[PDB]
Design a protein around this ligand. Structure first.
Ligand SMILES: O=C(O)CCCC[C@@H]1SC[C@@H]2NC(=O)N[C@@H]21
Ligand SMILES: O=C(O)CCCC[C@@H]1SC[C@@H]2NC(=O)N[C@@H]21
Ligand SMILES: O=C(O)CCCC[C@@H]1SC[C@@H]2NC(=O)N[C@@H]21
Ligand SMILES: O=C(O)CCCC[C@@H]1SC[C@@H]2NC(=O)N[C@@H]21
Lengths: 119, 120, 118, 120
């Protein structure tokens, strides 16, 4: 159920393939921030989740460097996939920018993104 | 650089290879939690960082399933590599467990881990 | 404004008074977790926000001890009040439980709550 | 144990009084950021912590407005006090700035601060 195209509330698009062994691979296009076009993502998911209706744990990373630009930053999303009629990937994220040691205290933004199969 | 064997303040072991086009691959062994032995990790790093003294942004994920056990959880680490005499990787992390909808509010732990190449 | 009775997506009830000195005071009742009835809260907000359409920054704390129960934990909410026609308070929160030193790595939960007066 | 002056790794100073009723009141001076001089803080703590000597849960808020400046922002710290010879308050924090709705996704910084009774 994870493989495919997902949309979040910001207008971003997350295109992922879930491998049999726990691999996530794909591309991410952000509607906001210091970003243009698609970026490589990689991550992992629980490939033998519980079957009690609980979600499937997963996470992925994007480093915000592609052929077009480099924001000198990286985001990780941690969350879970919930299937069914209203399928969702519910996440929290951490965006770290490369900083000097003196500015390290303000290096990391936190937020939440909910991904759905329709936008 | 980033490639090597790293240890955090909990005694966990992070073995990573940084590929030329931005890939991180390796293994993670946690000294704590519902975990034993090594788990696969993948991630990304900025393969052309700024040259002004800024760190190198990176992140990686571990899903806590291996041949021995499955915690039905995953952790991401977001942070930066800081080079120099004593290299460091400074991170914050999010650990999400699979939950029911009613328990989703308590799905995710947050913390910080600093990694160095110094064995416990 | 901020003063009033607010509810989040979990069904918790946040009753707050915003003082002109930047103080928040009131009570919190959680619909979830190791909690019953009302808990005291205190916090702060920006009492002279920007006039350019930006939200009003705020935060508050609840320690989960009252006359009935003690969870040995505390939550902080950090966020902003958005005054539109349908006012909201959008937050992220940290819940720290008291732990031993060896379990401190797993002391703190993170999440998000959005509050409305509906 | 909590009442007094505390220092973090950034060089900031936290002066707090812990009331019998669970109240934290005091002032905070940040060494970094859009801040000068002292700011009011208020918070809460567990006035009856566990008998097994676990830490004492607590939190507090600073809105970054005083008589000298207004950053249009607020920080909350959530953590625990640990007593004894090397007493500490170990925290994670969230700093939210007032933003437009369009910029709300980048409103909130996260970090960690460890407070000690002696300045590092
Ligand atoms: O500005 C940057 O440094 C790079 C772009 C970051 C976009 C962030 S990642 C978290 C959030 N979710 C999104 O879809 N976009 C923003
Ligand atoms: O308990 C689990 O669900 C799996 C093991 C989690 C271990 C965590 S990941 C964040 C922190 N840093 C570590 O090295 N170990 C813990
Ligand atoms: O379980 C505990 O330790 C005490 C109750 C915590 C309830 C949490 S606070 C964050 C979230 N928002 C709510 O309204 N309730 C939960
Ligand atoms: O820049 C601002 O908006 C106001 C000052 C924020 C300073 C932050 S609060 C978290 C961290 N810990 C500190 O002692 N200082 C920084």
């Amino acid at each position: 159920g994870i493989t495919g195209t997902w949309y979040n509330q910001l207008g971003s698009t997350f295109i992922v393939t879930a491998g049999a062994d726990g691999a996530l691979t794909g591309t991410y296009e952000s509607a906001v921030g210091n970003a243009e076009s698609r970026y490589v993502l990689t991550g992992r998911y629980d490939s033998a989740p519980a079957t009690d209706g609980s979600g499937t744990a997963l996470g992925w990373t994007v480093a915000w460097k592609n052929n077009y630009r480099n924001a000198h930053s990286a985001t990780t999303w941690s969350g879970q996939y919930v299937g069914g009629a209203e399928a969702r990937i519910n996440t929290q994220w951490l965006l770290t920018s490369g900083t000097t040691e003196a500015n390290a205290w303000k290096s990391t933004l936190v937020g939440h993104n909910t991904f759905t199969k329709v936008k």
